[PDB]
Amino acid sequence: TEEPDFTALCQKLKIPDHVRERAWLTWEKVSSKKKELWGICIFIAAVDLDEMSFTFTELQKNIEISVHKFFNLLKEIDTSTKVDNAMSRLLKKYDVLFALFSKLERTCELIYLTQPSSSISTEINSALVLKVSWITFLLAKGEVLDDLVISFQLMLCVLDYFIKLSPPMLLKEPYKTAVIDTRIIEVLCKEHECNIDEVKNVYFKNFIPFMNSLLPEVENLSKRYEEIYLKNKDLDARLFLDHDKTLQTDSIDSFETQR
């Protein structure tokens, strides 16, 4: 009496039999859009039974839903405290990451010149720096670190590092001037209105362990992040770089998530 499309979804997610059964019973309860609700029931069952055979991103890609919409759907279902906590934790992880990534994207736009490609020249964009600094930041955050403010000060340390390795001909003002010493970190702070001392502290006892007590090429760094993501079974934060639908929101969904 399971729908075949439900059975197939469970197969894609490697769901063991007891989890699949519990998820279906959950659906029958809630059942008193189908595929999204099924994914939610699978998540509820997997969390309640301590048997997660998939990552949250994987589940999302299968049912084609954003984090916020998932949250707003789930919150309307009576669930256990365990489930409530799991979902709240994921929501916070996502909101922190989304906030930090938005900031990274905006800051890069202020640091680096942009130029469309033409007959005379190749396109100049910050895709390479975005990718490497984001992944490097992702690795650093999980190493020596949720909690947005300290995370952001750490992101500035990562930004400082990559600015220093950057060609000045690719820098916008005032960053170009700042590379003609402790100058860059000051520019960043005097732009984002941060406590320089606290950022310095994070630099020393957070950032600086990480970069040795741990630059390989990007693909290597990506592979290391992937191992940690697969282990934690939450979100593949690299997908932010692709503006993956699973990680996009709209203003209305976001607002509802807080209500």
UniProtKB/Swiss-Prot annotation:
It comes from the Eukaryota. Dephosphorylated at the late M phase. SV40 large T antigen, HPV E7 and adenovirus E1A bind to the underphosphorylated, active form of pRb. N-terminus is methylated by METTL11A/NTM1. Expressed in the retina. Expressed in foreskin keratinocytes (at protein level). It is found in: Nucleus; Cytoplasm. Belongs to the retinoblastoma protein (RB) family. Tumor suppressor that is a key regulator of the G1/S transition of the cell cycle. The hypophosphorylated form binds transcription regulators of the E2F family, preventing transcription of E2F-responsive genes. Both physically blocks E2Fs transactivating domain and recruits chromatin-modifying enzymes that actively repress transcription. Cyclin and CDK-dependent phosphorylation of RB1 induces its dissociation from E2Fs, thereby activating transcription of E2F responsive genes and triggering entry into S phase. It is linked to Childhood cancer retinoblastoma: Congenital malignant tumor that arises from the nuclear layers of the retina. It occurs in about 1:20'000 live births and represents about 2% of childhood malignancies. It is bilateral in about 30% of cases. Although most RB appear sporadically, about 20% are transmitted as an autosomal dominant trait with incomplete penetrance. The diagnosis is usually made before the age of 2 years when strabismus or a gray to yellow reflex from pupil ('cat eye') is investigated. Bladder cancer: A malignancy originating in tissues of the urinary bladder. It often presents with multiple tumors appearing at different times and at different sites in the bladder. Most bladder cancers are transitional cell carcinomas that begin in cells that normally make up the inner lining of the bladder. Other types of bladder cancer include squamous cell carcinoma (cancer that begins in thin, flat cells) and adenocarcinoma (cancer that begins in cells that make and release mucus and other fluids). Bladder cancer is a complex disorder with both genetic and environmental influences. The hypophosphorylated form interacts with and sequesters the E2F1 transcription factor, thereby inhibiting E2F1 transcription. Interacts with heterodimeric E2F/DP transcription factor complexes containing TFDP1 and either E2F1, E2F3, E2F4 or E2F5, or TFDP2 and E2F4. Interacts (when hyperphosphorylated and hypophosphorylated) with PKP3; the interaction inhibits RB1 interaction with and repression of the transcription factor E2F1, potentially via sequestering RB1 to the cytoplasm. The unphosphorylated form interacts with EID1, ARID3B, KDM5A, SUV39H1, MJD2A/JHDM3A and THOC1. (Microbial infection) Interacts with adenovirus E1A protein. The Pocket domain binds to the threonine-phosphorylated domain C, thereby preventing interaction with heterodimeric E2F/DP transcription factor complexes. This is Retinoblastoma-associated protein. It comes from Homo sapiens (Human). The gene is RB1. The chain holds residues 52 to 355 of 928 of the full protein.
